[PDB]
């Protein structure tokens, strides 16, 4: 999987074909984060085959719709659970972020386990993602934003090189 | 690029005859004018038999002709053969069949005309029939040569029938081991 750009949460349901042995299969439901609806129903046949005795040729999916949240304006605090495969062994990991949407959260996880653990986009598996409200977030860089009357300046500002005169006569004041 | 073929894309058949015979070149120019204008096939079969080599136009004998014309349905048709008609002597009686060919021999065209036949070439055939309607087209035994009986599997393995090349068919020439089981082995 590439995680190309920001992701997009999909809610995919699917079932295996009705055999003469068994009618009415249970028609499982998952929650897949993917850049488009082709990868979403192609990670869906990876997590189902880990958990049931099913695969793509004996099954199908019957709904691949994007679910998108009830608050793209209210700021949220998410605690997620991972299953990354490291170089030495594998692990289990809880991890917190804080952004407007789960499209901006689990993308922010994928752009960071690649940073702080070198975990490429195919190893890491998402278990469950639910928000947790204020003063339950243990992770300290979240903990400093449970703070009303919050403030800080913009120290040491620099931007837009080469854009102006290439050889100006003006030393750039950083405010 | 396109593919990985081994090329047969150049066809290898005859398109203009390798003989510088100016009379056959006046019969190609007649027939390939009539091959693409007839909207039929009898010219286009004659037109490619004027291309063929000296071997593949074998000499049709007289008695193959007067046997294949005695079938029910060939009673007054004018037999056409591309190649030379040589007379046989093994038959005794020659009917008044009408033929049309290049180069009937001197003795055959006596024996056709004395019994009241008529011989033709391929220029008074076109006037008689541009379609070539009402004819039978014949050809001699193209595998009749002594060359073709040298050709088979190999003159050494089982069921040969291949006539191996010796300089004289006789005793102590290719008859000692390979031909009899008492000396060496038998093929």
């Amino acid at each position: 999987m590439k995680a190309s750009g920001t992701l997009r949460e999909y809610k995919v349901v699917g079932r295996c074909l009705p055999t003469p042995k068994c009618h009415t299969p249970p028609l499982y439901r998952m929650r897949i984060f993917a850049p488009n609806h082709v990868v979403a129903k192609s990670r869906f046949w990876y997590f189902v085959s880990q958990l049931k005795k099913m695969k793509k040729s004996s099954g199908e999916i019957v709904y691949c719709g994007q679910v998108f949240e009830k608050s793209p304006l209210r700021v949220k605090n998410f605690g997620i659970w991972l299953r990354y495969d490291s170089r030495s062994g594998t692990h289990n990991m809880y991890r917190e972020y804080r952004d407007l949407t789960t499209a901006g959260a689990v993308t922010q996880c994928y752009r960071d386990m690649g940073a702080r653990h070198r975990a490429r986009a195919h190893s890491i598996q998402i278990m469950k993602v639910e928000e947790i409200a204020a003063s339950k977030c243990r992770r300290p860089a979240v903990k400093q934003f449970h703070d009303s009357k919050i403030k800080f300046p913009l120290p040491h500002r620099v931007l837009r090189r080469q854009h102006k005169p290439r050889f100006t006569t003006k030393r750039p004041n950083t405010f | 690029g396109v593919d990985i073929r081994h090329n047969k894309d150049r066809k290898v058949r005859r398109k203009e005859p390798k003989s510088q015979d100016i009379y056959l070149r006046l019969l190609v120019k007649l027939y390939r004018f009539l091959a693409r204008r007839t909207n039929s096939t009898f010219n286009q079969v004659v037109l490619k038999r004027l291309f063929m080599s000296r071997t593949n136009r074998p000499p049709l004998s007289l008695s193959r002709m007067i046997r294949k014309m005695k079938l029910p349905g060939r009673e007054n048709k004018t037999a056409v053969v591309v190649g030379t008609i040589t007379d046989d002597v093994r038959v005794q009686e020659v009917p008044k069949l009408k033929v049309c060919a290049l180069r009937v021999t001197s003795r055959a065209r006596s024996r056709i005309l004395r019994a009241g036949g008529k011989i033709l070439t391929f220029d008074q055939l076109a006037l008689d029939s541009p379609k070539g309607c009402g004819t039978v087209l014949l050809s001699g035994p193209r595998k009749g040569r002594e060359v073709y009986r040298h050709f088979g599997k190999a003159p050494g393995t089982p069921h040969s029938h291949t006539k191996p090349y010796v300089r004289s068919k006789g005793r102590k020439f290719e008859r000692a081991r390979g031909r009899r089981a008492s000396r060496g082995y038998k093929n």
């Binding site: 999987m1 190309s4 082709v38 | -």
Partner: protein, 112 residues
């Protein structure tokens, strides 16, 4: 599927390919079809004599689709002008070589 890119088109991306990159065959010799008579003279045996009745069989794959698709010369599409991504990994794995199901309607327009 390591070497191809196959998906399911919709109707105007089958309507542009026939009109712009469609080429017919009579016996051999790929011709510009460019008429209603270059189709019906060689394929009016099947009742799909005109242009849009040909494109109706190729979309709703119906009666004479083997006889209709083998009439068409293979569509010689130009190089994709928007770009591609990595060319050798699957379209699941970020690349573009395989089953993509409706993103091929984007890609037909870039190939043409």
């Amino acid at each position: 599927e390591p070497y191809i890119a196959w998906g399911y088109p919709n109707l105007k991306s089958v309507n542009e390919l026939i009109y712009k990159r469609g080429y017919g065959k009579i016996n051999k010799k790929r011709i510009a079809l460019t008429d209603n008579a270059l189709i019906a003279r060689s394929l009016g045996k099947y009742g799909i004599i005109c242009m849009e009745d040909l494109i109706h069989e190729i979309y709703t794959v119906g009666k004479r689709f083997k006889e209709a698709n083998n009439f068409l010369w293979p569509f010689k599409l130009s190089s994709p002008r928007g770009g591609m991504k990595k060319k050798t990994t699957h379209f699941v794995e970020g690349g573009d070589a395989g089953n993509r199901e409706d993103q091929i309607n984007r890609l037909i327009r870039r190939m043409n």
